[PDB]
């Protein structure tokens, strides 16, 4: 009456669950969306050659949901489906080594993912979700399909959409161990006094308004509550890097003064990101393309700087 | 022959300047606008003393001010906003059935029905520029709101636009964080698959005008070659927008909030707005028509919502 084979199911490829499957029913009828080595097998019926194989499935019971939470650090039931949807594309991208870093050859507007991937290889950062940490290690080795698809899933973006580097880094930093990061700022306004503020976590390493770390330390002009202009400056910084962002204009990059940067060109609604890194000179990594130059000048949107512990000497 | 003026990129932070009447504004400030009019090649007049001029965000401080007000980093935004505003300030914005409309001009019908729709659904804008201008538009002064819509949509005055595209751009600048949509796709061969949409995708659907049809199920292809049934499982939003290629459709009073009618084709056409009050009202720019029934080439229908959960059992499909 009923013929069967034994297979394994998983949501993390670490915990394997024995399943006896009915060979007269499809995998989708029995498990829902089912993948065998990234290949969609939802519509097909079990075959004798499938016996003993491991199948990815979505978390549709309590055991699988706990494992998904522990591996991906998410409770969104749609997360693994969106990751698999993205992976179907990113598994076809090429991930060349460029200047010793894993880049991504351009496809489907993935330029923002390349400069994000390149940036992460240059700043000291640990990822909390085991899925992210594992996929980052594979990406550093040149096999970044899983990492890229995770990024898309964590940001709730799909292949082809315009990505923003600042927004993307912000999502990823929420899943990094940045709790020990600290920033202390002071704002000063004639006729209003002084006031200080302490930031922690992601907010302690990201700033929007100037690309220059030294300018942030010397003071930036900001509108006050009264309506006149005031001066905000960085008092103390505890973090392994800082990210400085600004609306793009024409910014000059010089060797040895920064770690890496991102540039935005083309049509503003559907444009193009490049990566600039400081090595023994400046390299512009443009997906698979590489140029070298003494200096660089353009519509820079984000600059990353190394840091450890900073304390101001101004009063 | 020198006067004081204010320059700004947001009309919030005003920067005092001294100008000389012997040179143009452009030689002193770069590109300069007075109520949207390009005054770059104009010399300061006595009557300009103390007035507020827009300039381009030409330094780090101004680019911050512009970003915090408009939520854009596009360097062309201000000039495009001002170019549109020079025109929209001359449009007329009559009250039609308690709502701010727009008298027809410059193919602005798509903006009129978008504006009429926004006044009937629960929506908050995130950019202060949009918030402030929307409050003025509700009160009848819609020139700045209409020029912002054009600038955010990268449309110029006179171009025929698209309500669905326009709403997409505006919803991306709205607070939709609490909006969630869960769908189920059921195939006789493949089984079930649920999906969760957030943000603009949680409130916009393209394929059917009827919210009730979206609840009972629409037929879609399945990669196995058969037809699958797609239906709404769960909806958390204060409204929903259902769109479909324009086709003859009967709008029944009391079954919807408002809708967009489009006569024409891909190159040229005209929008009208239909709203369901104690009866059906067709708002066509400044023109109002009342009817017990309405039938037309409908392309977008808006419905009120709060929390919906399906009663379909998948095994009963
Ligand atoms: Cl019109
Ligand atoms: Zn003050
Ligand atoms: Zn199927
Ligand atoms: Zn028209």
Swiss-Prot record, chain A:
Kindly identify the residues recorded as the active site.
111 (for pl-pro activity), 272 (for pl-pro activity), 286 (for pl-pro activity)
Role according to the record: Responsible for the cleavages located at the N-terminus of the replicase polyprotein. Participates together with nsp4 in the assembly of virally-induced cytoplasmic double-membrane vesicles necessary for viral replication. Antagonizes innate immune induction of type I interferon by blocking the phosphorylation, dimerization and subsequent nuclear translocation of host IRF3. Also prevents host NF-kappa-B signaling. In addition, PL-PRO possesses a deubiquitinating/deISGylating activity and processes both 'Lys-48'- and 'Lys-63'-linked polyubiquitin chains from cellular substrates.
List the range of the whole protein covered here. 1564 to 1878 of 4405
Amino acids binding Zn(2+) 4:
189, 192, 224, 226
Query: What name does this protein carry?
Result: Papain-like protease nsp3
User: Where is this gene product found?
Assistant: Host endoplasmic reticulum membrane
Q: What is the effect of changing residue 77 to S?
A: In strain: Omicron/BA.2.75
Q: Which residues form the Peptidase C16 domain?
A: 71-315
Q: How does it sit in the membrane?
A: Multi-pass membrane protein
The catalysed reaction is: Thiol-dependent hydrolysis of ester, thioester, amide, peptide and isopeptide bonds formed by the C-terminal Gly of ubiquitin (a 76-residue protein attached to proteins as an intracellular targeting signal)
């Amino acid at each position: 009456e009923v013929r069967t084979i034994k297979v394994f199911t998983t949501v993390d490829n670490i915990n394997l669950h024995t399943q006896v499957v009915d060979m007269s029913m499809t995998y989708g009828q029995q498990f829902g969306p089912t993948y065998l080595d990234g290949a969609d097998v939802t519509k097909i019926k079990p075959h004798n050659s499938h016996e003993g194989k491991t199948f990815y499935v979505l978390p549709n019971d309590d055991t699988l949901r706990v494992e998904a939470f522990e591996y991906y650090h998410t409770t969104d039931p749609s997360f693994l489906g969106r990751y698999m949807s993205a992976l179907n594309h990113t598994k076809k991208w090429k991930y060349p080594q460029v200047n010793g870093l894993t880049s991504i050859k351009w496809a489907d507007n993935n330029c923002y993912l390349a400069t994000a991937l390149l940036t992460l290889q240059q700043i000291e950062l640990k990822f909390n979700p085991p899925a992210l940490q594992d996929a980052y290690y594979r990406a550093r080795a040149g096999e970044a399909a899983n990492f890229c698809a995770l990024i898309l899933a964590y940001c709730n973006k799909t292949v082809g959409e315009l990505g923003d580097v600042r927004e993307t880094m912000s999502y990823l930093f929420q899943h990094a161990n940045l709790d020990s990061c600290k920033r202390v700022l002071n704002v000063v306004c004639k006729t209003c006094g002084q006031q200080q503020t302490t930031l922690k976590g992601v907010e302690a390493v990201m700033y929007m308004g100037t690309l220059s770390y030294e300018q942030f330390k010397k003071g930036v002009q900001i509108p006050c509550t009264c309506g006149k202009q005031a001066t905000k400056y960085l008092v103390q910084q505890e973090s392994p890097f800082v990210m400085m962002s600004a609306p793009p204009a024409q910014y000059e990059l010089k060797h040895g003064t920064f770690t890496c940067a991102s540039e935005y060109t083309g049509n503003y609604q559907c444009g193009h990101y490049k990566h600039i890194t400081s090595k023994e000179t400046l390299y512009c990594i443009d997906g698979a393309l590489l140029t070298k130059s003494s200096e660089y000048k353009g519509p820079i949107t984000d600059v990353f700087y190394k840091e450890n512990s900073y304390t101001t000497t101004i009063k």
